[PDB]
Amino acid sequence: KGTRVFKKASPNGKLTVYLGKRDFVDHIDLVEPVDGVVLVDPEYLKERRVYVTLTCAFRYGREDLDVLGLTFRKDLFVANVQSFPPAPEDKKPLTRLQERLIKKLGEHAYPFTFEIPPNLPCSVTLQPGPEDTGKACGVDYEVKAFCAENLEEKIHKRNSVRLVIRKVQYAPERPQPTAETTRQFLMSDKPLHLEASLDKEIYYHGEPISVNVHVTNNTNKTVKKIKISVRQYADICLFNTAQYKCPVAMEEADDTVAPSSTFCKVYTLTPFLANNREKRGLALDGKLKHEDTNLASSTLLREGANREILGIIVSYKVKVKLVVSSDVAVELPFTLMHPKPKDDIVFEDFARQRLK
Template sequence: MGDKAGTRVFKKSSPNCKVTVYLGKRDFVDHLDHVDAVDGVILVDPEYLKDRKVFVTLTCAFRYGREDLDVLGLSFRKDLYISTFQACGVDFEIRAFCAKSIEEKIHKRNSVRLVIRKVQYAPEKPGPQPMVETTRSFLIALMKVLVPMMHCAALLPRRASSVNVHVTNNSTKTVKRVKISVRQYADICLFSTAQYKCPVAQLEADDQVSSSSTFCKVYTLTPTLDKNREKRGLALDGKLKHEDTNLASSTIVKDVTNKEVLGILVSYRVKVKLVISRGGLLRGMLDRDVSVELPFILMHPKPVEPPLSRPQSGEEL
């Protein structure tokens, strides 16, 4: 009899082995207009169930403090919403348990909690090339800066990003240095809104642009987690056990005017700064550096479906 490829199944059982949850996948895609349905199988010992019912909940929770800080009945975790049929971060989990009613206290011995992820992938069709332009007036002359990003609007973590800088210097000033940085912005939306800003890639070049001249150059930066692991306020993608993670993908919201969105909203911008030479104390106070910011999307492409493999237990993931 020939070997047959099995179907990959995620499995997790309660401590007393009376309730078991089976899921075909743990990543569920947010398509903006809909989210993949979470479907699976619950196996319950009928003799253990008796006169009780089986409940399944889908919970989205936001943790804004370490678990070891949960003392005196205070929990640094807020459930954003619960659908019945549940470090700082947003997580989703499937919970199955036996009880006479859904309000009954849930015991660990007869309940199962299995973490899943809601993910977004880069659009299959690339969008328009992001570009921004600014003009700075120096008394009687102008300096014009044009910054288009090369390739496509959706860039990949750990892959080089090309920034094409065009400078038209019609002023009497001289650009003595070019600074470029990729910055991650994380808006924490819970009780109130707070924003964390963290540079994830930086570059500084001694490229000069003299008066009455033009300049064009492509700079390359690679935003990676490896060089930013120790930074505070950095948003990361959620991960399952025994998996590495990476910089958080950009958050795409269908309705940008909705002010009731809860969780962490991540965005990225490239900042280009031209350092201007200054002459004298008074001119140094009047002549400010020229800077411009360009938003862009940092996301993963939709992965190719993995080949079929043997079932895996949820405790191993």
């Protein structure tokens, strides 16, 4: 029942950024525009220019550090805009939010708008664990307002103000996700036929996944139990190539399958970051400390797209496994997307959260 807008001022107070929201939805076909305003103090500002830089960049190294010669970085995308003087230009028409934000402020709140390309990677992070914190890495979208005579002139952290916006992926549902099968001979004439499938291709966070297990046991062997499990896969495509893998869900059913007998059952489990705080190597869609953080959404491949510049490729697979009294198994691919969200101005500090 209101219209909130986040904000964050520079260490001093001269510069102050305002934004409608932290996250920004990437509809694959197009990313939402970055609406914002920057309140400049004409006093110390002098005649020099006020810039605003949006920057997507792959980081690698200690989480905290950022010093050159230690922390690696690579700008996957950069966009500079001159908020003062207002430049020509114009050109992007002011949004309803930018207008009302200027009204509340006073003849020193200058608009700025970034249009993010579709092929860019979403926000993502990967904690290697305490064993080797230096292996940390991820993609990050920064927003940085500052003031200087030119884009070349070095900045000063007291002047500038750094925000960190996330770009979240999304895509509506809608054919039946193909099944997966495997015949295996266990010291027998006839094969044990394992088969499984899913009710959906695209799952959202917190949503339960239903696995349709169906097993024609044509052997004289007995299946003692069945392990269902969701598995994350994360490939590091920059600075230091590697492939992580980690179970985000597990369920061991002591369900048996008699020889020559058929079996069927729909299992259900839900991948959840809650059980992952003690996990090593795991792709998150944000910082581990924030509450609004979740498991990294699945990375969309664009057929001819360059997967190297994507920084980190995340993917997911359900895995059925029959523990024979050898072990038969299968793996079902599936997409994990971010849930769709489905008045007077009210300010709020840009800080995420950590509680508790």
